[PDB]
């Protein structure tokens, strides 16, 4: 199952801060059992004002809750939630 | 590079139609050289009213244009564009 985050940063957040934000988020994989993998990226096309995408892999929808209530994720939010202006969350199983 | 589509269908579109829509879109990989891979899925969490996600792989941002102007993609849009109510498009390179 993929946990997909689409976000916009507040205008005051700097590039260095954004880098630190994603570095810290990626490193949660090592701390949170339920998180299997993380990739992120910045939209280059600007067709739509979301700018960044994060893809997180889980074994199942069930274990997403394990991540949600994990002190490390709660802690990540407690430190960084002032960074984002808007976000969208999706959970789905990629298929053909 | 990943070409990410987030969409909502119009209310009148049926499940069978949605299945046919994605089946046809997935099969474009065989027709359009620039398209390397496609996955799609339906959001189960409904936390946000986008419902579906499509992930398309390209070799580079440059070749996304090759896809955009390809008669098969233009043709796909010509047949199915009345199906969607809203969509968002992002192009990014997944990284850590
Ligand atoms: C890079 C964004 C990480 C935090 C994203 C987030 C924010 C929030 O306010 C509530 C959530 O359930 C989640 C999530 O499911 O991951
Ligand atoms: C499953 C949605 C396929 C069509 C998505 C689309 C719609 C549109 O109106 C303009 C576009 O440039 C694209 C695209 O880049 O793929």
Candidates B37, B15, B88; CA nearest to A96 is B37
* Tokens 């098969």 belong to residue: B72
Residue bearing tokens 């990626």: A26
* DSSP-based three-state secondary structure for B66: helix
Residue matched to tokens 């096309």: A45
List chain A residues with CB under 8 Å of B53. Answer: 4, 90, 92
Task: Calculate the dihedral angle through the C-alpha atoms of B22, B76, B14, A48, rounding to the nearest 10 degrees.
Answer: 80
Neighbour count for residue B77 (Cβ, 10 Å): 11
Kindly state the DSSP code that residue B31 receives in the 8-state scheme: T
Ligand 1 atom closest to the Cα of residue A22 is 1
Burial class (CB within 10 angstroms; exposed 0-12, middle 13-18, buried 19+) of A27: middle
Domain that holds residue A49: 1-96
CA–CA distance, A62 with A44 (Å, rounded to integer): 33
Give backbone dihedrals phi and psi of A46, rounded to 5 degrees, phi first: 55, 55
The answer to whether B7 and B41 are in contact (CB under 8 A) is: no
Gaps in chain A with C–N over 2.5 Å, residue before each = 48
Neighbour order of strands in the sheet with A52-57: A37-42, A52-57, A2-9, A84-92
Q: How far is CA A93 from CA A56, A59, A65, A81, B90, in A?
A: 12, 10, 16, 27, 19
Residues of chain A in contact with residue B39, where contact means CB-CB under 8 angstroms, are 94-96
Check CB contact of B14 with chain A, cutoff 8 Å. no
Count of structural domains, chain B = 1
| Residue in chain A nearest B3 by alpha carbon | A43
- Per the CB < 8 Å rule, is B43 touching A95? no
CATH number for the domain including A46? Answer: 3.30.70.100
DSSP B16: H
């Amino acid at each position: 199952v993929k946990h997909l985050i689409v976000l916009k940063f507040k205008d005051e957040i700097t590039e260095a801060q954004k880098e630190e934000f994603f570095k810290t988020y990626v490193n949660l994989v090592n701390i949170i059992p339920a998180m299997k993998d993380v990739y992120w990226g910045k939209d280059v096309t600007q067709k739509n004002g979301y700018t960044h995408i994060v893809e997180v892999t889980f074994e199942s929808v069930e274990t997403i809750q394990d991540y949600i209530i994990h002190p490390a994720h709660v802690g990540f939010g407690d430190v960084y939630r002032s960074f984002w202006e808007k976000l969208l969350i999706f959970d789905y199983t990629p298929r053909k």
